[PDB]
Amino acid sequence: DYINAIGRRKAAVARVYLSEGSGKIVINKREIEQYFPSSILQYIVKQPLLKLVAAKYDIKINLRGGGFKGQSEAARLAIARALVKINPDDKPALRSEGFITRDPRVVERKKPGRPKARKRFQFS
Amino acid sequence: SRSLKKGPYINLKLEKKVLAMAVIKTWARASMISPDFVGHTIAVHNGNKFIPVFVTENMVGHKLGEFSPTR
Amino acid sequence: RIVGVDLPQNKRGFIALTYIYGIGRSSAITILDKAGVDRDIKVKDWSDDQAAAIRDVIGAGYKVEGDLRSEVQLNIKRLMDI
Amino acid sequence: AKESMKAREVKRAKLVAKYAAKRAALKAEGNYEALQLLPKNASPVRLHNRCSMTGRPKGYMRQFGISRIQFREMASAGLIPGVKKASW
Amino acid sequence: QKIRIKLKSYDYMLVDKSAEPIPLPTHKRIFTVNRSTFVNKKSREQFELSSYKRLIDIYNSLPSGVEVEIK
Amino acid sequence: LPDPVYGDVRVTKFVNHLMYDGKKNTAFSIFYGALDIVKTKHSEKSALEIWKAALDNIIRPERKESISMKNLILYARKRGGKTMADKLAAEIVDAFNNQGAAFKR
RNA sequence: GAGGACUCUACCGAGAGUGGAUGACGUCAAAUCAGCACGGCCCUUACAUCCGGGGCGACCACGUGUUACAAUGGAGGGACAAAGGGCAGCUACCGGGCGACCGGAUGCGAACUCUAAACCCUUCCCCAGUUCGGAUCGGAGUCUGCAACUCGACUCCGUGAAGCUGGAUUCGCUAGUAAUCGCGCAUCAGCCAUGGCGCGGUG
RNA sequence: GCGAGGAACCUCAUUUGGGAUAUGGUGAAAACCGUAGGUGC
Ligand SMILES: [K+]
Q1: Which of A13, B15, C41, E34 can bridge C45 by disulfide, Cβ–Cβ 3.0-4.6 Å?
Q2: Interchain CB distance below 8 Å, F28 and A40
C-alpha cells in the first residue's frame, strides 16, 4: 500500500508514504515544484532518490514545524529510511553519502545573566 | 491630548470662584483656562510660592501650570 | 515651475513632489491620486493639462510655501510671547 | 515596611470598596463634572500592590502576593505547595 | 450521554495513584528570581511549578492536592 | 556539502566564505550572478574552470585554499563598483589575466 | 483507528556525548539595619502622624545599549511556513473611520481566542547626504486615569538634523555557537520596555 | 539597563504649606463647624 517512514530535523517532522508510480511528489496537498520554489530545496528533498530510483515512485509528504531548510532536510531523512525498507541491499549506498543519520542539534537554551546562549555582556 | 468626548478639564470650584468674582489663590495647576477667566488675576501654586498670572485671551486653552514654573 | 519651485525633472513624480516645503511622500501620493496622474512617469513627461491639474489640486486646500513658513513663524512667535 | 504605609493602604482599600458603585454609575454615563467630586482616595488608581506580610512595594508577584525574596525563602523552606527547584 | 472526569494536580505520581486514562500535556511554569537580596544581579536560580492533568470518560454512566472537574 | 548547480564542494566553501549575516542563498545568488557575468563579459574554458584557474593564480593545501578564497573575496570587496557580483567578476577575469591589486598580495 | 503528538515504563556500544544545577575546599572587618528579625544609642509639643502642591525627570565626564552611516541595500505589489507563552481578559463577525481603537454583537477561565519576520518572485531607485538616516520642532487627534503643564503611550500631516564604517586601546565566543530575524512573558489603569527573562527560523 | 522585574497622583522615604494629636457651611484636601512608632545611626 504505502511504505511508511518519519524524519525529524530541528523542530520539523516529516512523514512519507512511498508508493509505486512516476515521480509526482506532493507535499501538504501541494506540488513539490510549488511548495519549495528554490532549486536547492528541491535538490535536498529529492537527493536520495537520484542517489540510487527516481521516476519510479509516487511520494506524498506531510510537513509541520520549522522553517524551509529544516523541513527540506527532515523530508530528505524520511525518504532515505523509506527506501531501505523497500530493499535491504540499499543501506550502504545511502549511509555512505550520509543520509540515514539524524542530526540531533537543536537551538540551545538561553542561560540567565547573558543576552544569548554563549554570548556574554561586555565587561570593559 | 484630552479626548473630545470628555470635553475640557476645568476645575469646578475655581470656575465658581471666578464666576462669583482681588487675586484668587489656587493649587489647580492642571486646570485648563476657560474664556470666562479672561481679565482675572490667578495666583498658581508652584511648590513653595504663588506665582500670579493675569489671564489674557491668548492664553485660553492652556493649562494653568504652564505659566508657573516649578524648577 | 509648478509653484515657485523648480523640481528635478529626471525624478519620478511621487518623490519629486516632496521637494516642496509643504508636501511629504504621503501628501505627494494623495495629491497624485486626487489629480489622477500616474506615480511612475517622470516630471518631464507631464502634459500641460496634467501640470495644471496638479497645480490646482495643490492650491486651494494646501499650505505649501511662503504661507506655510509665515504660519510656522507666527506659531513660534506666539509660543515665545507665551 | 512601616505601619502608616499599611494603615493608609487599608484605608484606601476601604474607601475604594465603599465608592465602587457610584463611580461606576457615573462612568457608565457621560457625567464628569460630578465624577471629580469624589475623593481622590476613592479612585482605584491609588492602589499599590504591597507584600502581604513584609509590605515591600517592589518585586511583587501576583500569583502568591509576596515579593521575590520571600518567594525564594518559602520555596526553599517548602512552605509554598507545588513549587520545587529545577534540577538544571 | 457520558461523564468526563478531569483530574489535575502538581504531582504526577499522585495523580497516577489517584486515578485507580488519556494523559493530557502538562503545564510547566518557570520562575526566575535573584539569589541575592540586594544589587547582586546576574546570579539567578529557576523554580519550576508543574500542573499535571488527566482525563477519563465513563460512557452512559483522593489525596489533597488534586482538583477534579466532573462534566 | 554539495553545490546545488555544479555539485562541487569547493563552490559551497566559497559561498560559505562569501556569506554575510547568516544569509546563504544571497551569497549563492551573488556567486552565480558573478559566474554568469564572467561569461557574458570577456570570456576558452567554462566559467567553473576559469574560476578554478583564477583561484590557482591567486603549508597545508586546505589552508592555501582558504587563504586564497579569503584574499579573493577581500580584494573583490576592496575594488569599486555598484553590484557585488559585477565587482567580483572583475576579480575573476583579472586573476585569470594575472594582474591587478589582488595578485600576489 | 494508531502514522505523528501527548504522558508513564525497560535496555542503551567492548568494539566495525553536550548544556545546566549541586560547590565539603576558601580570603576580602567584601555587600545587604532600606526585604526580614535583632544587642546598643537617639527622637516623643515631634526624627511620630494626615493631606494638597512640587522633586526623584533640572544641565560636562564615564559605563551599558538601540539605530544608522547603505545595492549582500531602501521602497511598492504578490507567495511563505514556527516554537514556546498569555486570555475577566483576549476576541469570531458587521459597519463610523486615513489610522491609533469605538459600538453593536460571538466563543472562551483554556491540546474559543493574540504568533511571525527575515526568506521567494515582480517593479522602481543607480552611488546622490539620495526613494539612505530618522534627531528636533510645529499642528490635529485616540486611549488610560479625578487629573497627561512640569511629567505617559500610540496614530495621522508637515519639518526634516548629526551621521561617508570610526586613532591609542579594548570587549564577547569556538557550533545550531557568533551574526542576524521575528514572537512571547514577569511587574502593570496607562507606560518611559531600546531593559530583564525565554522561544524558535538560517547559519 | 542595579536594589527598581513599572517615580503623573499613590509608591515616596525628599521639599514648601495647612491640620489633628445625617446634613449644611467653611476648605486645595486633610479637617473644622452648627443644627506603641522610626525607610533614624
Ligand atoms: K499603580
Answers
A1: C41
A2: yes
Q: Is B11 in contact with B24 (CB distance < 8 Å)?
A: no
Q: What is the resolution of this structure in A?
A: 3.0
Q: Hey, is the C-beta of F23 within 8 angstroms of any chain A C-beta?
A: no
Distance D43 CA to ligand 1 centre (A): 11
- In degrees and rounded to multiples of 5, residue A19 shows phi and psi of -130, 160
Can you spell out the DSSP letters for chain A? --EEEEEE-SS-EEEEEEESSS---EETTEEHHHH--SHHHHHHHTHHHHH--TTS-EEEEEEESS-HHHHHHHHHHHHHHHHHHH-GGGHHHHHHTT-SS-----PPPPPTTSSSSS------
Considering only CA atoms, give the Rg of chain D: 18
Q: CA-CA distance, C15 to C25, in Å (whole number)?
A: 6
Strand pairing partners for E33? E45
Report d(CA C17, CA C29) in Å as an integer.
Answer: 9
Strand-pairing partners, residue D49, are none
* F4 CA: distance to closest CA in chain A (Å): 5
DSSP D30: T
Please state the length of chain D. 88
User: Residue C2 contacts by C-beta under 8 Å, 6 or more apart in sequence?
Assistant: C20, C51, C54, C55, C58
- Give the integer Cα–Cα distance in Å for F44 and F32: 19
Say how many residues make up chain C: 82
Residue F44, helix vs strand vs coil? coil
In chain D, residues 52-71 whose CB comes closer than 8 Å to chain B: none
E61 strand G contact, CB < 7 Å: no
Interface of D with E in 55-84 (CB under 8 A): 68-69, 71-72, 75, 81-84
Q: How far is the CA of D60 from the centre of ligand 1 (A)?
A: 12
- Whether B4 has its CB under 8 Å from any CB of chain D: the answer is no
For residue F60, give the 3-state DSSP assignment. coil
Ligand 1 mean position, distance from CA F5 (Å):
62
Order of strands, sheet of A58-64, starting from the edge strand that comes earlier in the sequence: A3-8, A13-19, A58-64, A26-27, A30-31
Four-CA torsion A34, F32, A74, A61, nearest 10 degrees: 20
Q: In what order do the strands lie in the sheet with B50-54?
A: B24-26, B41-45, B50-54
